[PDB]
Amino acid sequence: NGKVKAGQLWSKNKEELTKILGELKTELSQLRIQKISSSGAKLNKIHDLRKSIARVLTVINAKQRAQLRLFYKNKKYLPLDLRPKLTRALRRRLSKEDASRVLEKTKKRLTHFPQRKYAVKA
Amino acid sequence: MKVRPTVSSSRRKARKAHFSAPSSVRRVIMSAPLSKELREKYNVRSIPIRKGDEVQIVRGAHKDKEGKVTSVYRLKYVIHVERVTREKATGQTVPIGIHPSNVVITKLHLDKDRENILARIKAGREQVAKAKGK
Amino acid sequence: PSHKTFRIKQKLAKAQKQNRPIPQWIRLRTGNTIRYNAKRRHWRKTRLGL
Amino acid sequence: KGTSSFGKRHNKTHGLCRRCGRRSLHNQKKVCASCGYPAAKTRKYNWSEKAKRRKVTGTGRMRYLSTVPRRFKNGFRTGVPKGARG
RNA sequence: AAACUUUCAACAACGGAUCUCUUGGUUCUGGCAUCGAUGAAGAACGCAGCGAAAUGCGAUAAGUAAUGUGAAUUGCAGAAAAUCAUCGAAUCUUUGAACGCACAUUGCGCCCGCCGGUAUUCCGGCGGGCAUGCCUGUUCGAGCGUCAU
RNA sequence: GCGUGAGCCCGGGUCGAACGGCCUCUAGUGCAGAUCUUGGUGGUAGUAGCAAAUACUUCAAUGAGAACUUGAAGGACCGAAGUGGGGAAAGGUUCCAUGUGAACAGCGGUUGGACAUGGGUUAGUCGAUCCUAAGCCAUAGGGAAGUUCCGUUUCAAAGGGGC
RNA sequence: AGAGACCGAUAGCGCACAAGUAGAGUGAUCGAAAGAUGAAAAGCACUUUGAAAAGAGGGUUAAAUAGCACGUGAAAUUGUU
RNA sequence: UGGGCGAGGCUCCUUCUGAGUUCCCUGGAACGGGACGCCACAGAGGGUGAGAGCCCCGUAUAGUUGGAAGCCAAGCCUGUGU
RNA sequence: GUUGACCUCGGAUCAGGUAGGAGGACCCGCUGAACUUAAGCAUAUCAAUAAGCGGAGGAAAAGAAACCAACAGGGAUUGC
Ligand SMILES: [Mg+2]
Ligand SMILES: [Mg+2]
Ligand SMILES: [Mg+2]
Ligand SMILES: [Mg+2]
Ligand SMILES: [Mg+2]
Ligand SMILES: [Mg+2]
Ligand SMILES: [Mg+2]
Ligand SMILES: [Mg+2]
Ligand SMILES: [Mg+2]
Ligand SMILES: [Mg+2]
Ligand SMILES: [Mg+2]
Ligand SMILES: [Mg+2]
Ligand SMILES: [Mg+2]
Ligand SMILES: [Mg+2]
Ligand SMILES: [Mg+2]
Ligand SMILES: [Mg+2]
Ligand SMILES: [Mg+2]
Ligand SMILES: [Mg+2]
Ligand SMILES: [Mg+2]
Ligand SMILES: [Mg+2]
Ligand SMILES: [Mg+2]
Ligand SMILES: [Mg+2]
Ligand SMILES: [Mg+2]
Ligand SMILES: [Mg+2]
Ligand SMILES: [Mg+2]
Ligand SMILES: [Mg+2]
Ligand SMILES: [Mg+2]
Ligand SMILES: [Mg+2]
Ligand SMILES: [Mg+2]
Ligand SMILES: [Mg+2]
Ligand SMILES: [Mg+2]
Ligand SMILES: [Mg+2]
Ligand SMILES: [Mg+2]
Ligand SMILES: [Mg+2]
Ligand SMILES: [Mg+2]
Ligand SMILES: [Mg+2]
Ligand SMILES: [Mg+2]
Ligand SMILES: [Mg+2]
Ligand SMILES: [Mg+2]
Ligand SMILES: [Mg+2]
Ligand SMILES: [Mg+2]
Ligand SMILES: [Mg+2]
Ligand SMILES: [Mg+2]
Ligand SMILES: [Mg+2]
Ligand SMILES: [Mg+2]
Ligand SMILES: [Mg+2]
Ligand SMILES: [Mg+2]
Ligand SMILES: [Mg+2]
Ligand SMILES: [Mg+2]
Ligand SMILES: [Mg+2]
Ligand SMILES: [Mg+2]
Ligand SMILES: [Mg+2]
Ligand SMILES: [Mg+2]
Ligand SMILES: [Mg+2]
Ligand SMILES: [Mg+2]
Ligand SMILES: [Mg+2]
Ligand SMILES: [Mg+2]
Ligand SMILES: [Mg+2]
Ligand SMILES: [Mg+2]
Ligand SMILES: [Mg+2]
Ligand SMILES: [Mg+2]
Ligand SMILES: [Mg+2]
Ligand SMILES: [Mg+2]
Ligand SMILES: [Mg+2]
Ligand SMILES: [Mg+2]
Ligand SMILES: [Mg+2]
Ligand SMILES: [Mg+2]
Ligand SMILES: [Mg+2]
Ligand SMILES: [Mg+2]
Ligand SMILES: [Mg+2]
Ligand SMILES: [Mg+2]
Ligand SMILES: [Mg+2]
Ligand SMILES: [Mg+2]
């Protein structure tokens, strides 16, 4: 046993990952308990176990969030964590269509008298 | 003489960048020339040095000593060459730090990555020569 | 006093943990300039403000 | 007064403030002499440039504000590099 | 005559001037506009195989994912990259405008749901919620303020 | 050695990486003073002094080294409003074991509240937590340009019991 | 991000360094000192005297009067001749 | 008077860049001195054991390898007057 | 007659939103000194400044004349 590569975690179902995580957690937890009372150079394997646990948690979270985004596709309201985080001011400013809306009075004269392409000969 | 506004000729800035460069930049900084034979073979002038390269020392008190690069201590901007060593008071043997620009690479450690590198350099050099010769 | 709040106890714990000399292997690193713990505090010398 | 009166100093005018961490929270007034807690605004005065710069932005971690320039430089984009595992 | 004091010189002390250096300041110029209830700035406490500090990070804790590069890191140990760059995916303890009520207490509550103890009522574990002002809408209402049958 | 002079040049020693002459240009450009600023160092000077709280002594062990370490013995003091045994505030690890070069303990030091390495604080019943006091802060409202001030039940549609 | 007829560790920002740090104050606030061995630690093995610190030999280095009280090393002040 | 393309150009990311480490002396170490060469749209700067254009990173020049597609745009295609 | 309209006024952890703090060099307002100068000092000056308070952005503010002018007339704002 030892390190868990992230490449071999993207194909497993959440359940498979959580199972691996469990083993890693136990192994890591035990590693500590065992180390304290014993000369185990594996007192370095704790770094590997902790990183593997972090990797499994990251993969589980990423899969769950991808599934949630798929579920909330084409829905009017989606949770705040799934909503894009640009900036407070960016999220508050007017939308493109609303900012580009013009009056019918402006639209008529824009249709019939726009800025022309012209040249003036010397 | 520099022209481009993005380039700076500040001695302070140059020294700061050199002495605080990250490891990936230090890799490029610690380049070494190829031997004449390898240069003719690959059409490549210089390459970043790598552990397992075979080099010959051409500067310093250890001139003409040859050996395999056993470590590339980027943190100290030096390399360690096999059997290019020194003795402490206790008689214990410690490697001597050699700057890669003071050595020439006589034999290269070659794997596809180290080679895609050589092919890129060769293609760029050949293209530049052709364009200048147009 | 024997009567302590949790916050005060926690801060005393942190001060006690910081009260130590520097590791020996620190001084052997390249570019090291730390000679000794300059922020050492003693209960008889410098009073910590809670 | 003086030495004899200094022996009666066993009380505390100020305790630790929850907002700024200094021992400047008046125990009876329940107001911080440094940060102005519990007022919503942080206490700050233009006649003390030193006091202003001791706690201006940049003297702490900037856990979130330090990542804003990179996100702006890349345009506050979302998604993943075309061709990424996951 | 010695000693002592003083003067002069050589050497040795004390001290850190002078010289040379400079990953630092200072000033000018050019480009850019991007904090926060989707929880900012700031504070606290923690996190490394061996760390007190600084730096980094948040119980996924000296960091995870992803992309690029392409063989290190290094004080020792260890192992089969990296204390690398980039960075669009995440994590992000207690706090703090700080938001259940408080807080000089790691204090005291209520609601929903799940799992146990004989349990709608009590106890325990877990998760999600409960601040204020205001806007739009919804629904339930008050008033002989008022309109017709 | 030169110059009236400010100064300039050279010999010898030390030392280790830059520097100078000439003509212009430029200035944060020339010190004995300012009870000048910072830093360093003298005579005084091995001097003033280390004299409140009755007081030490013998043998032995330890140790390079013992008046102020320890054991035993003797002689003494505090004399229950104690130099006793425990607490509140305050301190924060000073508590315990082991070890100890320097520094500190204004003499010494083998000793130490010092230094170093490791340990140590166990609650349904003791406290906090609960209650209210003097008092403080909200709320409804009313002031104030405003930071905010008054207000604490007041010109408020303000709740809890069962089937 | 680029520059300078700028300053060069008592200068230049208070801060070239674990600096708004250490420390002081109840508090508001106040607020330092402190850069340089060597190209490379090659940071002195070993012998001897000493309880030890250290000394004397010896070793490393171009150089140890460059030995972590480390580039150079002035004056005040001091010791020996 | 409405719609859609759009060569082509400007952007952006990315690969690549000339020439001595030749001989002699000093030195612990040439990056110093002397001799002989080379590059230069590059003799800015920095590092390397002492003043290095040619030892190394970079430096000049428009180019080029591969890619995303952000802009502008000659000109085309096509509705139609209630 | 009751319900039913509509008019005000409310409840709700009702559905969806929004504000607070930071920063404040520059910008828009409010509030607002005294030292100082006048060889004294009170108006004055410092100054419509410092300190205090509120509110924004990459700029802000101003801005398309109830303007300037008096001319043979100019022609929003801003800045040199
Ligand atoms: Mg009293
Ligand atoms: Mg509050
Ligand atoms: Mg801080
Ligand atoms: Mg005379
Ligand atoms: Mg000295
Ligand atoms: Mg100097
Ligand atoms: Mg947070
Ligand atoms: Mg809430
Ligand atoms: Mg809320
Ligand atoms: Mg209480
Ligand atoms: Mg209860
Ligand atoms: Mg049950
Ligand atoms: Mg429950
Ligand atoms: Mg809960
Ligand atoms: Mg409703
Ligand atoms: Mg009604
Ligand atoms: Mg030198
Ligand atoms: Mg002057
Ligand atoms: Mg003087
Ligand atoms: Mg004079
Ligand atoms: Mg003085
Ligand atoms: Mg004196
Ligand atoms: Mg005497
Ligand atoms: Mg006396
Ligand atoms: Mg006496
Ligand atoms: Mg006495
Ligand atoms: Mg004995
Ligand atoms: Mg005695
Ligand atoms: Mg008596
Ligand atoms: Mg008696
Ligand atoms: Mg009594
Ligand atoms: Mg006792
Ligand atoms: Mg007692
Ligand atoms: Mg008390
Ligand atoms: Mg004890
Ligand atoms: Mg002992
Ligand atoms: Mg003593
Ligand atoms: Mg002594
Ligand atoms: Mg002792
Ligand atoms: Mg002893
Ligand atoms: Mg201690
Ligand atoms: Mg009780
Ligand atoms: Mg309780
Ligand atoms: Mg109550
Ligand atoms: Mg009030
Ligand atoms: Mg009101
Ligand atoms: Mg300074
Ligand atoms: Mg100094
Ligand atoms: Mg200073
Ligand atoms: Mg203090
Ligand atoms: Mg020095
Ligand atoms: Mg020698
Ligand atoms: Mg010397
Ligand atoms: Mg020397
Ligand atoms: Mg010296
Ligand atoms: Mg002298
Ligand atoms: Mg090149
Ligand atoms: Mg030679
Ligand atoms: Mg050089
Ligand atoms: Mg030469
Ligand atoms: Mg060079
Ligand atoms: Mg709601
Ligand atoms: Mg709301
Ligand atoms: Mg605000
Ligand atoms: Mg006057
Ligand atoms: Mg006057
Ligand atoms: Mg007067
Ligand atoms: Mg005025
Ligand atoms: Mg003001
Ligand atoms: Mg503009
Ligand atoms: Mg505007
Ligand atoms: Mg008009
Ligand atoms: Mg005009």
PDB file of C-alpha atoms (C1' of nucleotides) in Angstrom, chain F residues 16-91:
ATOM      1  C1'   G F  16      42.567  42.974  -0.453  1.00  0.00           C
ATOM      2  C1'   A F  17      39.244  45.296  -5.778  1.00  0.00           C
ATOM      3  C1'   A F  18      38.703  48.990  -7.420  1.00  0.00           C
ATOM      4  C1'   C F  19      40.813  54.211  -8.330  1.00  0.00           C
ATOM      5  C1'   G F  20      43.061  58.815  -9.886  1.00  0.00           C
ATOM      6  C1'   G F  21      45.127  63.534 -12.850  1.00  0.00           C
ATOM      7  C1'   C F  22      43.404  67.547 -16.291  1.00  0.00           C
ATOM      8  C1'   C F  23      38.944  71.120 -18.359  1.00  0.00           C
ATOM      9  C1'   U F  24      34.027  71.861 -17.709  1.00  0.00           C
ATOM     10  C1'   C F  25      29.091  70.575 -14.862  1.00  0.00           C
ATOM     11  C1'   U F  26      26.823  69.687 -10.056  1.00  0.00           C
ATOM     12  C1'   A F  27      25.986  69.723  -4.526  1.00  0.00           C
ATOM     13  C1'   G F  28      22.953  66.875   1.346  1.00  0.00           C
ATOM     14  C1'   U F  29      30.933  69.742   0.023  1.00  0.00           C
ATOM     15  C1'   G F  30      35.363  71.215   4.775  1.00  0.00           C
ATOM     16  C1'   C F  31      33.851  71.233  12.655  1.00  0.00           C
ATOM     17  C1'   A F  32      36.566  71.922  18.863  1.00  0.00           C
ATOM     18  C1'   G F  33      32.775  73.920  20.768  1.00  0.00           C
ATOM     19  C1'   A F  34      26.013  74.508  20.124  1.00  0.00           C
ATOM     20  C1'   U F  35      24.439  71.970  29.094  1.00  0.00           C
ATOM     21  C1'   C F  36      24.965  69.701  20.288  1.00  0.00           C
ATOM     22  C1'   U F  37      23.091  63.935  18.290  1.00  0.00           C
ATOM     23  C1'   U F  38      24.427  58.681  18.314  1.00  0.00           C
ATOM     24  C1'   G F  39      28.115  55.255  19.767  1.00  0.00           C
ATOM     25  C1'   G F  40      32.477  54.053  22.336  1.00  0.00           C
ATOM     26  C1'   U F  41      36.049  54.907  26.326  1.00  0.00           C
ATOM     27  C1'   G F  42      38.671  57.201  30.746  1.00  0.00           C
ATOM     28  C1'   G F  43      40.482  59.466  35.730  1.00  0.00           C
ATOM     29  C1'   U F  44      37.745  58.997  39.995  1.00  0.00           C
ATOM     30  C1'   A F  45      38.895  53.433  41.463  1.00  0.00           C
ATOM     31  C1'   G F  46      40.037  48.180  43.054  1.00  0.00           C
ATOM     32  C1'   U F  47      37.522  53.513  45.616  1.00  0.00           C
ATOM     33  C1'   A F  48      32.012  54.470  48.097  1.00  0.00           C
ATOM     34  C1'   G F  49      30.507  50.326  49.516  1.00  0.00           C
ATOM     35  C1'   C F  50      28.166  44.861  49.880  1.00  0.00           C
ATOM     36  C1'   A F  51      26.614  46.682  58.465  1.00  0.00           C
ATOM     37  C1'   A F  52      17.840  46.388  59.724  1.00  0.00           C
ATOM     38  C1'   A F  53      15.158  41.393  60.539  1.00  0.00           C
ATOM     39  C1'   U F  54      19.623  37.893  67.738  1.00  0.00           C
ATOM     40  C1'   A F  55      23.707  32.755  65.028  1.00  0.00           C
ATOM     41  C1'   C F  56      26.171  29.807  64.232  1.00  0.00           C
ATOM     42  C1'   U F  57      29.360  25.155  65.456  1.00  0.00           C
ATOM     43  C1'   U F  58      31.384  19.653  65.023  1.00  0.00           C
ATOM     44  C1'   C F  59      31.968  15.220  62.151  1.00  0.00           C
ATOM     45  C1'   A F  60      30.925  12.698  57.525  1.00  0.00           C
ATOM     46  C1'   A F  61      29.540  12.209  52.401  1.00  0.00           C
ATOM     47  C1'   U F  62      29.822  14.669  47.467  1.00  0.00           C
ATOM     48  C1'   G F  63      32.970  17.328  44.506  1.00  0.00           C
ATOM     49  C1'   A F  64      38.609  20.131  40.780  1.00  0.00           C
ATOM     50  C1'   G F  65      36.894  23.426  44.202  1.00  0.00           C
ATOM     51  C1'   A F  66      32.104  23.821  50.092  1.00  0.00           C
ATOM     52  C1'   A F  67      30.585  29.401  55.555  1.00  0.00           C
ATOM     53  C1'   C F  68      26.027  29.964  52.543  1.00  0.00           C
ATOM     54  C1'   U F  69      24.964  21.446  49.051  1.00  0.00           C
ATOM     55  C1'   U F  70      23.222  17.106  51.906  1.00  0.00           C
ATOM     56  C1'   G F  71      23.073  13.564  56.378  1.00  0.00           C
ATOM     57  C1'   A F  72      23.692  13.235  61.698  1.00  0.00           C
ATOM     58  C1'   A F  73      24.593  15.965  66.295  1.00  0.00           C
ATOM     59  C1'   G F  74      24.556  20.475  69.002  1.00  0.00           C
ATOM     60  C1'   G F  75      23.157  25.662  69.721  1.00  0.00           C
ATOM     61  C1'   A F  76      19.189  29.171  68.335  1.00  0.00           C
ATOM     62  C1'   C F  77      14.821  32.073  66.237  1.00  0.00           C
ATOM     63  C1'   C F  78       9.595  32.534  64.455  1.00  0.00           C
ATOM     64  C1'   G F  79       6.355  31.675  69.557  1.00  0.00           C
ATOM     65  C1'   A F  80      -0.350  30.470  66.997  1.00  0.00           C
ATOM     66  C1'   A F  81      -2.870  38.986  64.992  1.00  0.00           C
ATOM     67  C1'   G F  82       3.695  32.817  63.382  1.00  0.00           C
ATOM     68  C1'   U F  83       9.084  32.896  59.641  1.00  0.00           C
ATOM     69  C1'   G F  84       2.852  27.546  60.587  1.00  0.00           C
ATOM     70  C1'   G F  85      -1.378  25.206  57.328  1.00  0.00           C
ATOM     71  C1'   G F  86      -4.787  26.799  53.186  1.00  0.00           C
ATOM     72  C1'   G F  87      -7.354  30.483  49.853  1.00  0.00           C
ATOM     73  C1'   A F  88      -9.275  35.528  46.770  1.00  0.00           C
ATOM     74  C1'   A F  89      -6.857  39.048  43.170  1.00  0.00           C
ATOM     75  C1'   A F  90      -2.432  38.774  40.255  1.00  0.00           C
ATOM     76  C1'   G F  91       1.355  35.582  37.868  1.00  0.00           C
TER      77        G F  91
END
